[PDB]
Amino acid sequence: ANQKRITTPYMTKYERARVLGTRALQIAMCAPVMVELEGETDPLLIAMKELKARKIPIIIRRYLPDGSYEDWGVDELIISD
Amino acid sequence: KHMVDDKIHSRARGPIQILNRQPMEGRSRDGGLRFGEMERDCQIAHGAAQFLRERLFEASDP
Amino acid sequence: YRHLALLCDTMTCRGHLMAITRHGVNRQDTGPLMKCSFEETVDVLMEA
Amino acid sequence: KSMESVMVKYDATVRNSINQVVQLRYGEDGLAGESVEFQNLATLKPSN
Amino acid sequence: DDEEETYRLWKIRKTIMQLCHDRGYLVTQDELDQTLEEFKAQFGDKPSEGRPRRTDLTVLVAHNDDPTDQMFVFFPEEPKVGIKTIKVYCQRMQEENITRALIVVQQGMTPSAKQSLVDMAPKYILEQFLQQELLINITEHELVPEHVVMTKEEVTELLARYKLRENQLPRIQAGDPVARYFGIKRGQVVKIIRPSETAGRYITYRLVQ
Amino acid sequence: EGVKELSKKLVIVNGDDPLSRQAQENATLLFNIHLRSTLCSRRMAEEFRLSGEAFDWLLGEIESKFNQAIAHPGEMVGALAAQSLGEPATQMTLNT
């Protein structure tokens, strides 16, 4: 449900580091990209342009310590950076 | 007697011990560096879990 | 004060004092391989 | 080796490997140690 | 010293009244804080070979609400209490309709009577104490923060809202003198309000186990 | 109204449990007192004399700084604290 949102919408540095690294990984081994690029070769710059565009096709599963999990999509996740 | 030529060395995937599949010691055998206990704890404190995992499992003895 | 108070409350959180010894950390049931990773290994694994 | 296990969960509280709550917030304030700064308060000390 | 003895007995009665008030039993303000000289005029200033002595200044105090359960205190003349004497005390709880009693021993309390009180504690609850530990008060210290024993409804809604259990809640030992002062049995939850240097106030939760 | 709106803006404990609200207010009790003390109307009107654009831009800046100042979850706080107390022990001397 959209009501039981206990954790903060501010996505963390750990989350941004993990999604940036893995996004750069499939950009590196040539998955299709949906953000428009100005011409770059390195997946690090492509992934950070994706992260600042906030259009990642990945949703984060956070394990709340009771045993339940909660999903947070990057579109509704507000970026601290 | 401390000369840079005698002190400098580096390793890239050389030999492995008979008992355990780990790098050598000492630059004479092109030894490997010990990523030690307190360094592992400080890497934990940084939080680089994937970096520590790759440094501890598959770059050493997968 | 955050770290200092965190150290002291983690010390006292078990309802009693916790000296940083094998003589306490073996008594708390906080993982057999935590106990093994402490200074005594064979006895704590062997009791587990 | 005493306190290799303490970390903060997503509910902003402090739990161990046993997941026992020790602190409801990090440093009873939930505020970062790099972000916190010295401050002088003018309310306390002057006369009525 | 006779004056030292009567001052000690006055402070004993004062701290007993304050203990009962903080525990939740109906205690009048004059006994809550009466003057040492008022108590001397009440009892006679001469505990040694005089008309005031032990068991003379005992109280039977009822609760603030539901006065069915009332507490009362024992002051044995002997320093080291006798098991026959606590059996006479047991006869006194049998002839009373109330099950809450406290015992004040001048010296160490015998381990045979300790095991005895452990044995008949579930049928009727008896707590022993020592002259110095009830001569000084614990909640008056600035090091000691505020303690309030929470009830079952608050415990249930607390565990429901924080999604944690009683073992996950941090514990406090049952034989601690704070828990002995508050009279709290096994597995019961107490909130603590403490002054916080970096946040003003903190509300921490502990479980007597 | 701006300082009250900011005081309602910052949040540490979510939910509308009265226990949660009491815990929230005790958590940011000192900081709310300090920010209201700094934002007392006498000091704004006499000593500081900021404009409205400066005032609400300031409120946005304080909210953003506190939002950065919240503690992220998952940080290795226990080992961080153990190290952060071990290091001044290394600097401090028994011969001092």
- Domain boundaries defined on chain A: 1-81
Q: In chain C, positions 1-48, which contact chain E (CB-CB < 8 Å)?
A: 1-2, 13-16
Question: Was B34 annotated as part of a binding site?
Answer: yes
Neighbours of E23 (CB within 10 A): 18
CA–CA distance, E205 with E188 (Å, rounded to integer):
11
Tell me the residue range of the domain where E205 lies: 137-209
Q: Which of F75, F84, F87 to mutate to test the interface with C (most CBs of C within 10 A)?
A: F84
Structure tokens at A36: 């428009």
Size of interface A-D (CB pairs under 8 A): 16
- The answer to whether B54 and F82 are in contact (CB under 8 A) is no
Q: Token pair for residue F5?
A: 């709106």
Domain shared by E130 and E177, yes or no: no
Distance CA F56, CA F61 (A): 8
CA F69/CA D32 separation, integer angstroms: 5
Contacts of F77 in chain D (CB under 8 A): 6-8, 14, 26
d(CA F62, CA F41): 18
Helix, strand, or coil here: E81?
A: coil
Per-residue tokens: A22: 């893995």
Same domain for E62 and E132: yes
Are residue E148 and residue E91 in the same domain, yes or no? Answer: no
Q: Nearest chain D residue to E167 by CA: give it.
A: D20
Q: How far is CA E51 from CA C4, C21, E34, E39, F59, in A?
A: 56, 56, 20, 14, 74
Q: Mutate one of D5, D7, D9, D10 to test the A interface: name it (highest A CB count within 10 A).
A: D10
- E154 shares a domain with E113: no
Three-state secondary structure call for residue E190: strand
Task: Check the CA dihedral F65-F66-F69-F70 and report its sign.
Answer: negative
Show contacts of D24-27: CB within 8 Å, 24+ apart.
Answer: D24/E202, D24/E203, D24/E204, D24/F23, D25/F12, D25/F13, D25/F27, D25/F71, D26/C2, D26/C6, D26/F71, D26/F77, D27/C1, D27/C2, D27/C3, D27/C5, D27/C6, D27/E198, D27/F71
- CA–CA separation, E4 vs E208, rounded Å? 36
Identity of the amino acid at C42: V
CA angle B28, B31, B35 (to 5 degrees): 150
The distance in angstroms from the start CA to the end CA of chain A is: 27
For residue F34 the two structure tokens come to 């300090």
DSSP string, B7-62: H----SS----SSSS---SSGGGTPPP---HHHHHHHHHHT-HHHHHIIIIITT--
| Domain-terminating residue out of E120, E136, E152 | E136
First vs last C-alpha separation in chain C: 37
Residue E72, beta-bridge partner list: E60, E101
D21 to E204: CB separation less than 8 angstroms, yes or no: no
User: What CATH number does domain A1-81 carry, 1.20.1070.10, 3.90.940.10, 3.40.120.10, 3.30.9.10?
Assistant: 3.90.940.10
Report the C-alpha gap between A24 and A43 in whole angstroms: 5
Same domain, E109 and E171: no
CA distance linking residue D37 with residue F68, whole number of Å: 13
E99 burial class (0-12, 13-18, 19+ CB within 10 angstroms)? Answer: middle
Q: Are residues E132 and E151 in the same domain?
A: no
Per the CB < 8 A criterion, the answer to whether E19 and E134 are in contact is yes
- Is D39 an 8 Å CB contact of chain F? yes
Q: Tokens for A1?
A: 């449900």
Structure tokens at D17: 């490997």
- The total of other beta-carbon atoms located within 10 Å of residue C16's CB is 14
Element (H, E) at E42: helix E36-43
Same domain, E171 and E132: no
Please tell me what resolution, in angstroms, this structure has: 4.6
Give me the residues paired with residue A71 across strands.
Answer: A61
Burial F68-96 (b: 16+ CB within 10 A, else e): ebbbbbbbbbbbbbbbbeeeeeeeeeeee
Q: What's the token pair of residue E40?
A: 């001397």
Experimental approach was cryo-EM
Into how many domains does chain E fold? 2
Domain of E123, CATH number, reads 3.40.1340.10
Chain centroid to CA C3: 18
Tokens of F74: 């998952």
Task: Kindly determine whether residue F80 and residue B45, on different chains, have CB atoms separated by under 8 Å.
Answer: yes
The CATH number of residue E195's host domain is 3.90.940.20
Rounded CA-CA distance F42/E58 in Å is 60
Contact F12, F70 (CB under 8 A): yes
Nearest chain A Cα to D9, which residue?
A65
Largest CA distance in chain F: 57
User: Which chain E residues are within 8 Å of C13, Cβ to Cβ?
Assistant: 170
